[PDB]
Amino acid sequence: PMEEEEVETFAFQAEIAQLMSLIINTFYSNKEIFLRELISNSSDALDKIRYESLTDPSKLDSGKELHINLIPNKQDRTLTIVDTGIGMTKADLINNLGTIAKSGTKAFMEALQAGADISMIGQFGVGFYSAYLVAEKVTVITKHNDDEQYAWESSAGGSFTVRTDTGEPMGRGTKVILHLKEDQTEYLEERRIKEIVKKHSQFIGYPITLFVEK
Ligand SMILES: Nc1ncnc2c1ncn2[C@@H]1O[C@H](COP(=O)(O)OP(=O)(O)O)[C@@H](O)[C@H]1O
Ligand SMILES: [Mg+2]
């Protein structure tokens, strides 16, 4: 039986839209930091679960390990970062992923104009959009205990959609899927991934596993 999904489209906040064109339309060295940003966001989500214990012991009764999986698919040209963190409600995606102003956006854009390293992006409050250094389209699937499963997705161009995901259930947590641009396939190689997690993500307080296709 055919399933029905409601799809809502939203504008990026003006400055975030602008930071996004800048990220996509300019060359930057050191684009590898995108993974560091996605891992540290997964790692934060995992911390939330740890402390969510204290606000209601209920969350103690979960079986899932707290961890991060990296999954390259060369057939598809995707890189997926999966965590079992706290996930996000519909409201959270809309508010946290593109609609609401961050104070550091304009500062970041001026800094890059004066030639700062793209690596500074996390300290300006806008770490998430580093994904657009390597990917031409990002999908975020997420499931929070308070809510149903939602997919967020953007190819930039000024807006994003949120819909109910009636696909594969994922359980609590967040999956970030990057459709890599054609020039950026190095980041599907096992050795390159291990190199950059070694260099930039060495003090994450949770297990990271990399799945490699035999
Ligand atoms: N894997 C994730 N799990 C839960 N929430 C996430 C995840 N990735 C991003 N977010 C949400 O998106 C927001 C934006 O993240 P980011 O752009 O890196 O800024 P910051 O991490 O400094 O808040 C986060 O504050 C978080 O609420
Ligand atoms: Mg962040």
Curated annotation (Swiss-Prot):
It is found in: Nucleus; Cytoplasm; Melanosome; Cell membrane. The gene is HSP90AA1. This is Heat shock protein HSP 90-alpha. Belongs to the heat shock protein 90 family. The TPR repeat-binding motif mediates interaction with TPR repeat-containing proteins like the co-chaperone STUB1. ATP binds at residues 41, 83, 102, 128. It comes from the Eukaryota. The chain holds residues 11 to 224 of 732 of the full protein. Homodimer. Identified in NR3C1/GCR steroid receptor-chaperone complexes formed at least by NR3C1, HSP90AA1 and a variety of proteins containing TPR repeats such as FKBP4, FKBP5, PPID, PPP5C or STIP1. Forms a complex containing HSP90AA1, TSC1 and TSC2; TSC1 is required to recruit TCS2 to the complex. The closed form interacts (via the middle domain and TPR repeat-binding motif) with co-chaperone TSC1 (via C-terminus). Interacts with TOM34. Interacts with TERT; the interaction, together with PTGES3, is required for correct assembly and stabilization of the TERT holoenzyme complex. (Microbial infection) Interacts with herpes simplex virus 1 protein US11; this interaction inhibits TBK1-induced interferon production. The modification N6-acetyllysine is found at residues 48, 74. Molecular chaperone that promotes the maturation, structural maintenance and proper regulation of specific target proteins involved for instance in cell cycle control and signal transduction. Undergoes a functional cycle that is linked to its ATPase activity which is essential for its chaperone activity. This cycle probably induces conformational changes in the client proteins, thereby causing their activation. Interacts dynamically with various co-chaperones that modulate its substrate recognition, ATPase cycle and chaperone function. (Microbial infection) Seems to interfere with N.meningitidis NadA-mediated invasion of human cells. Decreasing HSP90 levels increases adhesion and entry of E.coli expressing NadA into human Chang cells; increasing its levels leads to decreased adhesion and invasion. ISGylated. The lineage of its organism: Eukaryota, Metazoa, Chordata, Craniata, Vertebrata. Residues 1-214 are annotated as: Interaction with NR3C1.
